Design a protein around this nucleic acid. Structure first.
Ligand SMILES: Nc1ccn([C@H]2C[C@H](O)[C@@H](COP(=O)(O)OP(=O)(O)OP(=O)(O)O)O2)c(=O)n1
Ligand SMILES: [Ca+2]
Ligand SMILES: [Ca+2]
Lengths: 942, 347, 347
DNA sequence: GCTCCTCTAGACTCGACCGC
DNA sequence: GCGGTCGAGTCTAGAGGAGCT
C-alpha cells in the first residue's frame, strides 16, 4: 500500500518514495507527542475533519549520494563550488606587481607585467579576476574603460569609443563592443560589471560565476533600513564600529581601515562628456585601479571570513548560481516601450484637455453670482478688472467701390484711438481672478489658448474636478495642507450639506480653520497626523481612489475621465525612466544557436536580445535578492499603463520557459518550524494543520479565515497575515486596519488588532521557535546554518531591533530554500543533460529557460527538486517525513513568456487587444505532477 | 433625440423631422446637410487634408469618378478606384516608397444611399507593412481624438480578414452603440495584382535599393458619419466643436445706425480677407434679448460674438464674447484680427 | 494642342495620352483629373466661393444628393426644395440666394460635370436688375484671372418663354465654347413644385410678401479650368497665383548632403505652415541639370524656384527665380517666406 | 519600534522700476 | 509724485536613491 498516514491522519509521502529518501524503518512516533498534538488540534476544532487522500505517486528518483539527504546536498554543493573556490583561493594569496605608473592607450586588453611594462593581449587568460568597469553615462551605456587584476599581473581595457574619435556610433548595442572575456570574476556590485561582458549574453551558458563583495558584506555585517538610517544620520551603539553602509569607501574602511578611498571630485564618467574622459585618461585610470585594489583588499578580508559564517557549501553554490539571471527578450520590447510611451503621452494630453474643459465650463458660474453656491470653487477669486483707458436695387460698379472704401476709411480712422490704450496691455480683465493666473500672457511667446498653465499639482485642480473624499468636498488651507469638509465669501455649507445627502470620524475636527457650517478634517497622510499632504494626487492615494472613496463627485464626464486617467498613468510615471533605460544587447544571428535559427517560429526579420538584471544576490540583511525593476510584486492589471513588461520577456523560438511558483513557501516554512519545535510531526500546530489541510477553493486557509473574521478583503488580509507572521506588533495591525478602513476609529482598530493577535495560540509554538533562534548568542538559519549579520547579534545590539531579526529568520530560511532549489536543479540539469539554464527568481517564483524538446523533463526535474527541498527542510528540522500535499508543485508552468498565469491575456491600456492578438503569444500549459509523469513516463533520462 | 432638433433648427442638416432618423443618417440615404453642417464637413475635410496630405512629402491627391462602368451601377467604394492611378502617380515620386494617394468624395452605399468618403490608399514595401500599419493606426486614432472633446469614445479594434490579413477598425461610441468610422486593412498585393495582370515589374517601388512589389493599405474614413460623430460628441445648449472645426467663427452683430453699419461692413470685409469666416449679425429686423441671441449662437458653435457698439466710433473698443468661456472682453478693434488668427491658428 | 500633353505629363489630367479627346473633356465623360488638376479645380472653387458666397451677405451654401434609379438633372431642384427650408436662414427676407459646387449629370449613358450654379430669389420688380448685376459680376470674375480678358465674351439670347438670358463664352483656339449661361426662369418651377399653399411661396420682400422669380446662373468649373489653361498657353504656363496648384520648389546643390537636407526640410516646413504649397524637390538623390529642372518646375506653373547650396552654409544666400521674369536673385532664409507671401497677396 | 541626501514644482513674499 | 505689475528668493511639499554609474 502506497498510502501512508501519520498519527495526525495527514496523508504523508507515498511509501514508494519515502523509502528512497528517508530510508526504511524510520522511528516509532512518541505517544506523548501524538497525544499533545491531538489535544492541540481538537482544542482548535480542526481534529476529525476528513480530507480525501491524494492519488499516491510512484517514481524512480536518481541515486542519492552519501548516507542521507544532508550529505547528498553537501556533496552536490562541494562538487559544484570546488572549481570556483580553487580560483578564489588562488586569488586570495598573490604577489601582485606594482601598479603601472602610466597606462597604455591601445584598444582591447593590455598586460602590465613586472615594473609597468606594457604588453598587448586579447583575453585576460586568467581564472580569477578582480574587475571594475567604468561607463560614460552621458554618451550612453557602452563601457568606456576597465581595469582588472589577476594573481600574476595587471590588466586594462579601453573601448573603441574612447581610443578612436569617429562619427556617431550605433545607438543599438551588440556583443561586438562589450568586454571580451571555469572562471571567477570578483567585484563590488559586480552585477553592474556583469552586464558589460560579451560572453554573458550568449544563450548557451559559459561556465563563469561572479562573486560580489557587496553581497558578502550584506551577508556578513549588513544593516537594516532603520539601522542604516540611524548610521547615516549619526555618521546600544557598538554596531557602528562593526557594520557600515554599502559604499565601497565605507566597506573598505570597515574591513580594511586606514586611508580613505580616492573618490573623483569632477565625476567625468557620470557628468562629463567624452572629451573630458579622453583628456583625463591617466587620472581616471588610476582612480579605477585604486577602486580595484580596494575591492581586492575587501575580498581578501571577506572571503575567509565569509566561509566561516556560511559553512554549508549549498549557500555559496546557490549564491554563485543566483548571479547569472538571464531575461531573454525579442523585438516586441522596443514596440512595447514605444506604445507605452505614446499612450502615456496621449493620456496626459487628454487629462490636460479635460482639466482645461473643467476650467472653461466653470467660468459660467460668474454669471448670476452662482459661484457662491458651488461647494468647491467658492474660495477662488472672481472679481473683474475694468478696461481702463488713458429692396434697394443692385449697386452699380462705382457704388460698390465707394461704399467699400467708405466703410474701410471709417474703420481705418479708428486706428488713431490707439492713444487711449495703455502702453502695457492688460491680461484678460473680463475673466475671473483665478482664471487670469492660468492663462499665459498674450505677450508671452509661448501663448496657448485657454488655461494652458493648469496642472495636477496646482491648488485649483482638486477644486475643478470636484474631488470628494467619502462624498465630502475637498478643501485646501495653507496652515494644514489638503483636507475635506464634512457638512452639518461665505462657504456654501448648504450645498455641501445637500451633496453629502445624495452620496463621522476622521483625522481631526480641526476648528482652527473655521469653514462655516463644516468641520475641516484633514487627509490622512502616510507619515501620520503630524504631517500635512500637499497633493491629493500623490502616489499614496492611488488605492484610495481605486477603492471608490476618493471620487470626482458630481458627474460631468470630464471630472472622472480625468481622475481615471490619473489612476491609469499612476505606474508608468514612476518607472518609465528605469524601464526605458534597461540595457538590451541584440544578439546577431551569427551568434544564435542552431536550435533558434532553424525553428518554424523563428523570424528572419526579428531581433532577439537579453536583458541581464543588475541583481544584488544579497541585497538585505535577509540575503534576498534586490532589484527594483524586475523583482517586485506586479502584474498586468486591466487599468494600468505599461504594466505588461514581464509578459514581454519572451523565450526565443525553439526555447520555452519552464518555471513554477512555490505555494506559500514562507507560510509553510513557518509552519514546519513550528511543528518541528512543538511535537516533531507535521500538523501538530494548528497553523500547520490549516496550512496543510486548508483549501483556497473552500475558503479554509488562513487568508480566507482571517478575511471572514475581520471582514476585510482577501488582498488586505494577505498583507495583514504576512505582516503578523513577520513579527509586526499590535500597533502595526491597528495602522493597517485604519488605513484599509477609514470608518474604523482608533479604539475599534486597537480592539480588532488585539483580538486577532490573541487568535498559547494557533501559532505560539512557531513564534517561540522564531524567537529562540533569534535571541541565541549566534542566530543561525535552521536549515543551512548561515549566520546573522554582525550588526544584529544580541551581543552587540541587545534589547533592540528584534523584529528585524525575527523577520530575518523566515526570510533567510526562504533564501536557503531558494539556494537548495538552485543547486538541486543545476545537479539534475548537468547529470541528465537537460539543456537549460537559470532565467530569474522573481520573489518565490523560479523560472528556467529550457529547450523545447525537454519542457516535460524540466517540469519533472522541478517537481523532484521541490520534493527534495521540502524533504531536506523536514530532515534538518528533524521530522524524516513529508506530507503528500506539499510534496510537489501544484502546477508547473510551461509558457513562452514570464506571466503569473498561463491564461492571462494581459489586457492593459497599452495593449487593449491582448497578448495573442498582436504579439502572437499563445497560452501555456499548467501541469500537475500526474500529467508530468504520464508525459515523461516517469524517467528523467531520455 | 434632442440633438436632432438642434441640428435641424440651426441648419446643420435640413429636411422634415420624420426624415431625420438614425437609420436614415447612418444608412447613407438622407435628405441632405444644411449650410452649417456643410461647413463643418468642409472644416473636417480641410483638417484631414492638412494632417494627411499637406505635412507629407509623398502624399498626392487623386480623382475618382462617381460612376463605375462595366460590371451600369454607381460607385460604392473609393479604394477600388484609387488603385487605378497607382502606376500613374509613381512618376511624381520617382518610384520612391513609401507613398500614397488621397481623395475626399461621395460614395453610394446600397441599402440607394451615399456617404462622404475619405481615402488614404497608402503603399509600403512588404518588409515594413506591419510597422506602417501600426504607425498609421496610432496616427489616425490620435487624429480622431485630437479634435474630439471625449477621446475615450473613439476606440480601436484589431481584426483579421477572411485571409487572416491584419487590420484595424475604428469606432465612435455613439449613444446607441459603436459604429464603424474607419478601416485600416493590410490588403497586401491581392488588389493590385488582380487589377494589373501580366508582368508585375510596373508596380515595383524603390524600397531603399531593393525593388519590391508594394503592400497596399487603405484608411477609408466616412466623413459623413465622422461629422455626425463630432456633432454627437460636442453635445445650456452648446456644441463644443473644436476651434479648428467650428463652421462659423465670429457672429459680427451690431449694437447712429448708418455709421455702425459702415463700421460693421468694414470689419466684415477685414475678417473675411484673413480666412476667418463670419456670420453677418447686422441684417436682422427683430430686436432680441442678448441671452436669447447668445443661446441661438451657441447652438451654431460660434467661437466669438463680436458686437460693434456705438462707442467704437469714439475709442474703438468692441465687445467680444467667447463660447466656451461665457465671459465677454472689450478688445480694441485694431487688434481683433491678430487675436482671432492667433486663437484659431494654435491648433 | 500641345497643352494637353503638358497637362497629362505634369499630372493635371489622368488617363492615357491616346484617349485625350476634346469632346470627352467638354462633356464630363473624361476619365478624370490628375493631382495638380484636382488642386487647380479646388483653387478655382475656393476663389468662386470667396467671390460669390464669402464676400456676400445673403448667399449661402447648399448641397443636394446625386440620386433622386436615375440621378439629378441639375443642381437647381435641390435649391427649390430648400426654398421652404432656407426661408428661415435669411429670416424670410426676400430676396435671398443659394450657391453650390456639385456634380451635374450629362449623358454624352452617364456623365459627370461639376457646376457653379447660383440661384437668386429676387422679387419680380428687380429680376432684370439683379440679372444684369450677376452678369456683370460673373464677367468681371471670369476676366480677373485671365491673362487676356478680351477672349472671354458675352451674349444676350431669348428663350421660348420670353425670358431674357445671357450666355458667356471663351474664345478657344478652335472656336467659341460656352462656359456659362444665365436664365430668368421665373416662378413657374417653384409654383409647379409647390401647387397652392401661398403661405410658403411668399416672403417678406419689403413690407409686403411676394413669390420670387428665380434666376439661374450656371458656370462649368470643369470647363473653366480648360478655359484658364488655354489662357496661359519657350514652354511656360503662366497662371495667376490664386489658381496655380503648387507655387515654390526647393532644391539642393552640391554637398554636404545632410545639412543641406536639414535646412531644406526646415524651409519646407516653414513655408508649409504658412500656407504656401511647396514641391519637395530636395528628396531626389540625383539632381539633374538646372535648365531641365527649372523647365519641369515651369511646366507645373511653379511661381518661384529655390536652390539651396553649400553657399547657404557660409552666408545663407539662396537662389530665387521667378518664372515670369526668368531672372535670378539672392535672398536670405528669413526673407523668403515673407517675399512669397507678399508676391501671392499683391497679385 | 522608522531619516539622510539631491532635485523639481507650486505659492507667497518684498524690493524695484515705470507709466499715469 | 504715486500706484501696478514683475522678478529674485525662500518655504513647503513631494519624489528618486539609500550601490554605481
Ligand atoms: N505583506 C507581504 C505579502 C507578501 N510578501 C511576499 C511573500 C510571497 O512569497 C511573495 C509573493 O506573494 P503572492 O501573494 O503573490 O504569492 P502567494 O502564493 O502567497 O498568494 P496566495 O497564498 O493567495 O496563493 O510576496 C511580502 O514580502 N510582504
Ligand atoms: Ca563595480
Ligand atoms: Ca506565492
Amino acid at each position: 500500500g502506497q498510502l501512508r498516514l501519520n498519527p495526525l491522519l495527514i496523508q504523508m509521502l507515498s511509501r514508494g518514495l519515502h523509502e528512497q529518501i528517508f530510508g526504511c524503518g524510520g522511528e516509532m512516533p512518541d505517544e506523548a507527542a501524538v497525544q499533545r498534538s491531538v489535544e492541540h488540534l481538537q482544542k482548535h476544532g480542526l481534529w476529525g475533519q476528513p480530507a480525501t487522500p491524494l492519488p499516491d505517486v510512484e517514481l524512480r528518483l536518481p541515486r542519492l549520494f552519501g548516507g542521507n539527504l544532508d550529505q547528498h546536498f553537501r556533496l552536490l554543493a562541494q562538487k559544484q563550488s570546488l572549481p570556483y573556490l580553487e580560483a578564489a583561493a588562488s586569488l586570495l594569496e598573490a604577489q601582485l606587481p606594482p601598479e603601472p605608473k602610466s597606462w597604455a592607450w591601445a584598444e582591447g586588453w593590455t598586460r602590465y607585467g613586472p615594473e609597468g611594462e606594457a604588453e598587448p593581449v586579447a583575453i585576460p587568460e586568467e581564472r580569477a579576476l578582480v574587475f571594475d568597469v567604468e561607463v560614460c553615462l552621458a554618451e550612453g551605456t557602452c563601457p568606456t574603460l576597465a581595469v582588472a587584476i589577476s594573481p600574476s599581473a595587471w590588466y586594462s581595457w579601453c573601448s573603441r569609443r574612447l581610443v578612436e574619435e569617429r562619427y556617431s556610433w550605433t545607438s543599438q548595442l551588440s556583443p561586438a563592443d562589450l568586454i571580451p572575456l571555469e572562471q571567477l570574476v570578483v567585484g563590488h556590485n559586480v552585477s553592474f560589471d556583469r552586464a558589460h561582458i560579451r560572453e554573458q549574453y550568449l544563450i548557451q551558458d559559459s561556465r563563469m560565476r561572479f562573486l560580489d563583495t557587496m553581497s558578502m558584506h550584506m551577508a556578513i555585517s549588513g544593516l537594516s533600513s532603520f539601522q542604516r538610517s540611524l548610521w547615516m544620520g549619526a555618521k546600544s551603539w557598538d554596531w557602528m564600529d562593526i557594520s557600515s553602509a554599502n559604499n565601497l569607501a565605507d566597506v573598505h574602511n570597515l574591513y580594511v581601515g586606514g586611508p580613505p578611498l580616492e573618490k573623483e571630485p569632477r565625476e567625468l564618467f557620470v557628468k562629463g562628456s567624452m572629451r573630458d574622459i579622453r583628456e583625463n585618461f591617466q587620472d581616471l585610470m588610476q582612480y579605477c585601479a585604486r577602486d580595484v585594489w580596494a575591492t581586492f583588499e575587501v575580498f581578501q578580508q571577506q572571503l575567509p571570513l565569509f566561509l566561516e559564517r556560511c559553512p554549508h557549501p549549498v549557500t555559496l553554490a546557490g549564491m554563485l548560481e543566483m548571479g547569472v539571471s538571464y531575461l531573454p527578450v525579442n523585438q516586441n520590447w522596443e514596440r512595447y516601450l514605444t506604445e507605452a510611451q505614446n499612450t502615456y503621452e496621449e493620456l496626459q494630453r487628454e487629462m490636460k484637455k479635460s482639466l482645461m474643459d473643467l476650467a472653461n465650463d466653470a467660468c459660467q458660474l460668474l454669471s448670476g453670482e452662482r459661484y457662491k453656491e458651488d461647494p468647491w470653487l467658492w474660495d477662488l477669486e472672481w472679481d473683474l478688472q475694468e478696461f481702463k483707458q488713458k429692396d434697394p436695387g443692385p449697386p452699380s460698379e462705382e457704388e460698390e467701390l465707394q461704399r467699400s472704401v467708405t466703410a474701410h476709411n471709417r474703420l481705418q480712422q479708428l486706428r488713431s484711438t490707439t492713444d487711449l490704450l495703455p502702453k502695457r496691455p492688460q491680461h484678460l480683465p473680463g475673466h475671473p481672478g483665478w482664471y487670469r493666473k492660468l492663462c499665459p500672457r498674450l505677450d508671452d511667446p509661448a501663448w496657448a489658448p485657454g488655461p494652458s498653465l493648469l496642472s495636477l499639482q496646482m491648488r485649483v485642480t482638486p477644486k475643478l474636478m470636484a474631488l470628494t473624499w467619502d462624498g465630502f468636498p475637498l478643501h485646501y488651507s495653507d496652515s494644514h495642507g489638503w483636507g475635506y469638509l464634512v457638512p452639518g465669501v461665505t462657504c456654501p455649507y448648504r450645498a455641501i450639506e445637500s451633496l453629502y445627502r445624495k452620496h463621522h470620524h476622521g483625522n481631526g475636527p480641526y476648528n482652527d480653520v473655521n469653514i462655516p457650517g463644516c468641520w475641516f478634517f484633514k487627509l490622512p497622510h502616510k507619515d501620520g497626523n503630524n504631517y500635512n499632504v500637499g497633493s491629493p494626487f500623490a502616489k499614496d492615494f492611488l488605492p484610495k481612489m481605486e477603492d471608490g472613496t476618493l471620487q470626482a463627485g458630481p458627474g460631468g464626464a470630464s471630472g472622472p475621465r480625468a481622475l481615471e486617467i490619473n489612476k491609469m498613468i499612476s505606474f508608468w510615471r514612476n518607472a518609465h525612466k528605469r524601464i526605458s533605460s534597461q540595457m538590451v544587447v541584440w544578439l546577431p544571428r551569427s551568434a544564435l544557436p542552431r536550435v533558434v535559427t532553424r525553428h518554424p517560429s523563428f523570424d528572419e526579420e526579428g531581433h532577439y536580445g537579453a536583458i541581464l538584471p543588475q541583481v544584488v544576490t544579497a541585497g538585505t540583511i535577509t540575503r534576498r535578492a534586490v532589484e527594483p525593476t524586475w523583482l517586485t510584486a506586479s502584474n498586468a492589471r486591466p487599468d494600468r499603463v505599461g504594466s505588461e513588461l514581464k509578459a514581454m520577456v519572451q523565450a526565443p523560438p525553439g526555447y520555452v520557459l519552464v518555471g513554477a511558483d512555490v505555494d506559500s513557501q514562507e507560510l509553510w516554512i513557518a509552519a514546519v518550524l513550528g511543528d518541528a519545535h512543538f511535537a516533531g510531526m507535521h500538523g501538530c500546530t494548528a497553523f500547520g494543520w490549516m496550512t496543510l489541510q486548508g483549501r483556497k477553493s473552500r475558503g479554509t486557509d488562513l487568508h480566507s479565515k482571517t478575511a471572514a473574521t475581520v471582514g476585510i478583503s482577501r488582498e488586505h488580509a494577505k498583507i495583514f497575515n504576512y505582516g503578523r507572521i513577520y513579527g509586526a506588533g499590535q500597533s502595526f495591525a491597528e495602522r493597517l486596519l485604519m488605513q484599509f478602513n477609514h470608518r474604523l476609529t482608533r479604539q475599534e482598530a486597537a480592539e480588532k488588532a488585539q483580538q486577532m493577535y490573541a487568535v498559547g495560540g494557533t501559532e505560539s509554538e512557531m513564534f517561540n521557535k522564531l524567537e529562540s533562534i533569534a535571541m541565541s548568542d549566534t542566530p543561525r538559519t535552521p536549515v543551512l546554518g548561515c549566520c546573522i549579520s554582525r550588526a544584529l547579534e544580541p551581543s552587540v545590539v541587545q534589547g533592540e531591533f528584534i523584529t528585524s531579526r525575527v523577520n530575518w529568520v523566515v526570510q533567510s530560511s526562504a533564501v536557503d530554500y531558494l539556494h537548495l532549489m538552485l543547486v538541486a536543479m543545476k545537479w539534475l540539469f548537468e547529470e541528465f543533460a537537460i539543456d537549460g539554464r537559470f532565467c530569474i527568481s522573481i520573489h518565490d517564483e523560479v523560472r528556467y529557460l529550457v529547450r523545447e524538446e525537454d519542457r516535460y523533463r524540466a517540469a519533472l526535474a522541478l517537481q523532484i527538486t521541490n520534493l527534495l527541498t521540502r524533504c531536506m527542510f523536514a530532515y534538518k528540522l528533524g521530522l524524516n517525513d513529508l506530507p503528500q500535499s506539499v510534496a510537489f508543485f501544484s502546477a508547473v508552468d510551461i509558457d513562452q513568456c514570464l506571466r503569473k498565469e498561463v491564461t492571462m491575456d494581459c489586457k492593459t491600456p497599452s495593449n487593449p487587444t491582448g497578448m495573442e492578438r498582436r504579439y502572437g503569444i499563445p497560452q501555456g500549459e499548467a501541469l500537475d505532477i500526474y500529467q508530468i509523469i504520464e508525459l515523461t513516463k516517469g524517467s528523467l533520462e531520455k | 433625440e434632442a440633438l436632432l432638433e438642434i441640428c435641424q433648427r440651426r441648419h446643420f442638416l435640413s429636411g422634415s423631422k420624420q426624415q431625420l432618423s438614425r437609420d436614415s443618417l447612418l444608412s447613407g440615404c438622407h435628405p441632405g446637410f444644411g449650410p452649417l453642417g456643410v461647413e463643418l464637413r468642409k472644416n473636417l475635410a480641410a483638417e484631414w487634408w492638412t494632417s494627411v496630405v499637406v505635412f507629407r512629402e509623398q502624399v498626392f491627391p487623386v480623382d475618382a469618378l462617381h460612376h463605375k462602368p462595366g460590371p451600369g451601377k454607381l460607385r460604392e467604394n473609393l479604394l477600388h478606384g484609387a488603385l487605378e492611378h497607382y502606376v500613374n502617380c509613381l512618376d511624381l515620386v520617382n518610384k520612391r516608397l513609401p507613398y500614397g494617394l488621397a481623395q475626399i468624395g461621395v460614395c453610394f452605399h446600397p441599402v440607394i444611399g451615399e456617404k462622404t468618403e475619405a481615402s488614404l490608399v497608402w503603399f509600403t514595401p512588404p518588409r515594413t507593412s506591419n510597422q506602417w500599419l501600426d504607425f498609421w493606426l496610432r496616427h489616425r486614432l490620435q487624429w480622431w481624438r485630437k479634435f474630439a472633446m471625449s477621446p475615450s469614445n473613439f476606440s480601436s479594434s484589431d481584426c483579421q480578414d477572411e485571409e487572416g490579413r491584419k487590420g484595424n477598425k475604428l469606432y465612435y461610441n455613439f449613444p446607441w452603440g459603436k459604429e464603424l468610422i474607419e478601416t485600416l486593412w493590410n490588403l497586401g498585393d491581392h488588389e493590385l495584382l488582380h487589377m494589373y495582370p501580366g508582368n508585375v515589374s510596373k508596380l515595383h517601388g524603390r524600397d531603399g535599393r531593393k525593388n519590391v512589389v508594394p503592400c497596399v493599405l487603405s484608411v477609408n474614413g466616412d466623413l459623413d458619419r465622422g461629422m455626425l460623430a463630432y456633432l454627437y460628441d460636442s453635445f445650456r445648449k452648446v456644441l463644443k466643436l473644436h476651434p479648428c472645426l467650428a463652421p462659423i467663427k465670429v457672429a459680427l452683430d451690431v449694437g447712429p445706425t448708418l455709421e455702425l453699419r459702415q463700421v460693421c461692413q468694414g470689419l466684415f470685409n477685414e475678417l473675411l480677407e484673413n480666412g476667418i469666416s463670419v456670420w453677418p449679425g447686422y441684417l436682422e429686423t427683430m430686436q432680441s434679448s442678448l441671452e436669447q441671441l447668445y443661446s441661438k449662437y451657441d447652438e451654431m458653435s460660434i467661437l466669438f460674438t463680436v458686437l460693434v457698439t456705438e462707442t467704437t466710433l469714439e475709442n474703438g473698443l468692441i465687445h467680444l464674447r467667447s463660447r466656451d468661456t461665457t465671459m465677454k472682453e472689450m478688445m480694441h478693434i485694431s487688434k481683433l484680427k491678430d487675436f482671432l488668427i492667433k486663437y484659431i491658428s494654435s491648433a
